[PDB]
Amino acid sequence: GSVVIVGRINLSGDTAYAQQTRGEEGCQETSQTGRDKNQVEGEVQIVSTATQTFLATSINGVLWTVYHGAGTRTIASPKGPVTQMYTNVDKDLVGWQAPQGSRSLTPCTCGSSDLYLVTRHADVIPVRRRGDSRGSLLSPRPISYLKGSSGGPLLCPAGHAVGIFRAAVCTRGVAKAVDFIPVESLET
Ligand SMILES: C=C[C@@H]1C[C@]1(NC(=O)[C@@H]1C[C@@H](Oc2nccc3cc(OC)ccc23)CN1C(=O)[C@@H](NC(=O)OC(C)(C)C)C(C)(C)C)C(=O)NS(=O)(=O)C1CC1
Numbered sequence: 001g002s003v004v005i006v007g008r009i010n011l012s013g014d015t016a017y018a019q020q021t022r023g024e025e026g027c028q029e030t031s032q033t034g035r036d037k038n039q040v041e042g043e044v045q046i047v048s049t050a051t052q053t054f055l056a057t058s059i060n061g062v063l064w065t066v067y068h069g070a071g072t073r074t075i076a077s078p079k080g081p082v083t084q085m086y087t088n089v090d091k092d093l094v095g096w097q098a099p100q101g102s103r104s105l106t107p108c109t110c111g112s113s114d115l116y117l118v119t120r121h122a123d124v125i126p127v128r129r130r131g132d133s134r135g136s137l138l139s140p141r142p143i144s145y146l147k148g149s150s151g152g153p154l155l156c157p158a159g160h161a162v163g164i165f166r167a168a169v170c171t172r173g174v175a176k177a178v179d180f181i182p183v184e185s186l187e188t
């Protein structure tokens, strides 16, 4: 089946919030047909297959997410299932042409090390960047709370895209840091 948009994380106001646009059955039906006519908007989508839910983020006109979420699946669209335009399984990165109605986050030109991770729960978590693909959590979270948030953006103070959340750094059974795909690698 296809990956289906089932919600979004709205980042337009000073406070992020999640919006659900499809329920469980609708998700499963839409995955099977690959036909999705729902209006798209915003930069961060909540996406789901029959068995996994995670995030997708539009940057550079491409809707990006993680391979360990989407596999090589098509995404449901107004015209039926659409094949991936980008697939790098080793980087854990896939992408489709962004849906009409979506907006892309602008890649960060700040070089800021003060980052913010956007989760599927709309928790925007402070993160200190340490390297090209790593930053430390500045507020404690369990691995379990971050699960389902892969594919979500790391933002800089200005709301620019710094990276895509790929994996959590687990130390002594809790989330200590995040591993992310740098926006510089999201080349079209
Ligand atoms: C808590 C949340 C994290 C963000 C989240 N990602 C994970 O669960 C990821 C998935 C898997 O990693 C990787 N797979 C494939 C290729 C990879 C290529 C890489 O690089 C090219 C690096 C990692 C890779 C294991 N993993 C970890 O994060 C693991 N961490 C990990 O591997 O950390 C390293 C990378 C520092 C070793 C962990 C924490 C399970 C032990 C998530 O929410 N997923 S999800 O639930 O949405 C789900 C799609 C449905």
Ligand SMILES: [Zn+2]
Pocket (backbone or CB within 6 Å): 107, 108, 109, 110, 111, 112, 156, 157, 158, 159, 160
């Ligand atoms: Zn910036």
